[PDB]
Design a protein around this nucleic acid. Structure first.
Ligand SMILES: [Mg+2]
Ligand SMILES: [Mg+2]
Lengths: 47, 78, 136
RNA sequence: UGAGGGUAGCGGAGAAAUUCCAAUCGAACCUGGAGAUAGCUGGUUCUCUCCGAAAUAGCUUUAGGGCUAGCCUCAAGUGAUGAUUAUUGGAGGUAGAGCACUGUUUGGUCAGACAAACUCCGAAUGCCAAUUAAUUUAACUUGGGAGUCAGAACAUGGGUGAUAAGGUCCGUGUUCGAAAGGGAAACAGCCCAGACCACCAGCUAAGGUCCCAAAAU
RNA sequence: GACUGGGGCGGUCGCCUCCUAAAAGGUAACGGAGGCGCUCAAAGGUUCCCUCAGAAUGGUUGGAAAUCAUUCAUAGAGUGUAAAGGCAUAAGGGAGCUUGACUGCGAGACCUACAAGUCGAGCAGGGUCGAAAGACGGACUUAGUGAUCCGGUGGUUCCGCAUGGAAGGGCCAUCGCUCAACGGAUAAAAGCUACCCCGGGGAUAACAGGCUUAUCUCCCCCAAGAGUUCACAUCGACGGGGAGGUUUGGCACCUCGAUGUCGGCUCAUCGCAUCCUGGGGCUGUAGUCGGUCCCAAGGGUUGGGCUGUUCGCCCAUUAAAGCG
RNA sequence: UCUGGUGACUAUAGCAAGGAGGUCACACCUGUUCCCAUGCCGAACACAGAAGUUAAGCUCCUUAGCGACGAUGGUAGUCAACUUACGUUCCGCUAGAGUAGAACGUUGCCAGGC
């Protein structure tokens, strides 16, 4: 199954990205890091 | 009996938009293509989906370089 | 029954029949030939009938080379149907000739035997042919 | 079978046929809502002057209807940006031809052949340009008003059909549509040619010169 | 529901690539031939290096195509998934670090009725690989999708009906569709009419006219052979060429404010491709009878049973029981 | 000119058989003390370098067998015109593909040492 998810920053509580993952190849939550809007920095992101 | 056929894609207008010798501006689209039938030359930038366009504004030339390969250049002074 | 083993497409457009022959104008193997002078399709049943007619009068004392082959198939729909709603199945196979093209060649037989041996095959072919000997 | 009576329209009566209910009954008649509604038919009345189309695209509970775009018209505004050849540059793979590739194919690596979905090659024209010269007179912009969305033959490139139809579906050109006149015996589409009105003058086109019937037995 | 070589029945409806498409773009048919409604946390970014298919020879013979080495190769393999254009600049084949599968934008142009769709140098904010110049806002390229209204979820420096709060609305970010008849009538929908009724159309069918001649009816060329030998007395294989416009059809031009449809009675009339009679030519014609083919339309061409019959089959005749 | 670097005109430069040459250089070649290297291997990419040789590479020269290039002349098509219905003809432009002759064993730029 491929189900879209919606990332969220941790230090600031705000959804700011969308992705899609494969439920077989990655059963655990995705933990990339991307540019944020409030801090002008690059904190983490996690579903 | 029946037919299993018909059913075509419509069109994508896919050829030369500007012609050899005229003053093109800074972002004009110079060719639409699948693959690279005609290469980007100098002062010309190949875009994504291979649609090469101009960068600085000047005259255009379609010039040959190899055995079966071609390129498009744009030169500055008009 | 002359037909290709496999063709890449079974339903083709009809071939063009005006002008003059592309190539195959000269006798090149045998010694006497049969060149057509009018344009028509020939449909591979009228080559089974003009080959055997040449074979019997020669008493199988020479060789026969047919220099055409039906490549192109031609269609037809059954009787008492309305127009459109498809394109019919393959009926048979045609071959186009144009005025100049050698059809048949013979070798290994005399001239006055072969001249009365090619007349028995032009009356089973539609086109008006004549009797051409080799380039000298 | 006479006489007097009863059942009434979303209703009566029916030994049952959609049968009868004031010459009409798959749901009577009369005035009212009501000038119901109609993308469908017929009709629409005075005269001259100038310009003069379309029968195509896209979407539609759409296919004989509608809306925007295309083609005509009147007025304002920019003002050679419109057309035509001559020279010049360049994009592109048709006709033709050829098997180097993908498949087809006849006779002993050699000789020969075939191709809408094959190309080592490849015209004639067309198309886009220069801001270059020569002849001509259009062209874009903003606003007012409609029409048209059933097209037809002939010529010439091809599809479908049977190298069938005055067949049907697309590309380019002309005439009819909206066009009289001379010719084709008669005949919207073929060939010559575009009528401002008058004349009992003239020279010619397509086609014609014995006679009907103008002109050479 | 609509298209529909009348309607029904079957089929198909949107997006992608090729061909017909007539060497720029564009271009139709119930014309020819295939896919799509997804998948990848590495199959994406960057940096450094490598080049393939098969052929042939050899040996645990795993046919030399399991694996193994040498030559030859010019692109004949491969590129997530159809086909076209494209590339060993690699856009193909392996490793390490990695999140640009970024936030705010966007001069210009392609394309187009409108709504949308597509490419975009460059400027700032934060980053990543590389020594650096530099490259990177997804994948070799194009398909993998759906207006509005309405509701749900997280944020908000916006309003909040006397004032202070709140219930509510606003913008930014995302979610609910085989609305697949894919520009989507509504949150919600199948039939019968020969009991039928109004508005239209020869724009569109059934009968007849017309064009065409695949079918249908006759006619002919070549000649293998059947006929003791013998192609042509007679028959005419496999193949080729036409005429007629009676059959079954194809096209939808004339008539839907009427062209109203089969056979036999009554009465005709014309064609020659002749059933009878008249005149000939061959004959495998002894004689009687026949068979074929050519000239010939002047007259003639029966009476009944069975069927609504068209064909037809039978019974008794006759010079003959002609086809249109 | 003559050698090496380095971009251009890009098979008229190629591919293949022969033949000549080497302190000026490029190579061939010996090595693993280390940075560096194999998903197997100093073969390769690095790195150290008295010695060893023109054999292959590169460099020069000639032979045109193979690939590439290619006229003139004629034909096929075809824009325009005139009759025409014929698998058409005649006239005026343009001009192919194949084939013959032939050109052909590269023409040059810029810095560095002879
Ligand atoms: Mg814009
Ligand atoms: Mg737009």
């Amino acid at each position: 199954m491929r189900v879209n998810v919606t990332l969220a920053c941790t230090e600031c509580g705000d959804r700011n990205y969308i992705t899609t993952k494969n439920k077989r190849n990655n059963p655990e939550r995705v933990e990339m890091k991307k540019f944020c809007s409030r801090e002008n920095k690059q904190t983490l992101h996690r579903e | 009996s029946s037919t299993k056929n018909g059913r075509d894609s419509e069109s994508k207008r896919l050829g030369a938009k500007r012609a050899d010798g005229q003053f093109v501006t800074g972002g004009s689209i110079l060719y639409r293509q699948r693959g690279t039938k005609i290469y980007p030359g100098e002062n010309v930038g190949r875009g994504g989906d291979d649609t090469l366009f101009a960068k600085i504004d000047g005259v255009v030339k379609f010039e040959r370089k190899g055995r079966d390969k071609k390129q498009v250049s744009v030169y500055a002074v008009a | 029954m002359l037909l290709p083993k496999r063709v890449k497409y079974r339903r083709q457009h009809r071939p063009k029949t005006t002008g003059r022959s592309k190539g195959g104008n000269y006798v090149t193997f045998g010694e006497f030939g049969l060149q057509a002078t009018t344009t028509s399709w020939i449909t591979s049943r009228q080559i089974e009938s003009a080959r055997i007619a040449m074979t019997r009068y020669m008493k199988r004392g020479g060789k026969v080379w047919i220099k055409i082959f039906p490549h192109t198939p031609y269609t037809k729909k059954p009787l008492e149907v309305r127009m459109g709603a498809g394109k019919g199945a393959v009926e048979g196979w045609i071959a186009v000739v144009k005025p100049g093209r050698i059809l048949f060649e013979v070798a290994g037989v005399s001239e006055e035997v072969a001249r009365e041996a090619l007349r028995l095959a032009s009356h089973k072919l539609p086109v008006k042919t004549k009797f051409v000997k080799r380039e000298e």
